[PDB]
Amino acid sequence: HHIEVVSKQMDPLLPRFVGKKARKVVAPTENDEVVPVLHMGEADPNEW
């Protein structure tokens, strides 16, 4: 069917972006893989 895409001129008075409305969202954190966290006391506590 093809297509042709065309913008519509807004009535300048009416709000442009009819749906832009401040709302807050919690995004998920999508973890695909794990990043290995790779690193290399006794009397010490008496000091610390």
């Binding site: 001129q9 009535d11 300048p12 008075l13």
Partner: protein, 49 residues
Amino acid sequence: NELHPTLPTNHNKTKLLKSLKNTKYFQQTTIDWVEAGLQLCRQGHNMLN
């Protein structure tokens, strides 16, 4: 006003109305002035209400 000039804005060539009249939504006519004053008062009053 003589001491501190302003030196206006080229590219200002775009005006509110020249942009406004372009659209479908504004139409042009003549009218008596007092009538435009009265209309504008009713306009305003509806806006603030």
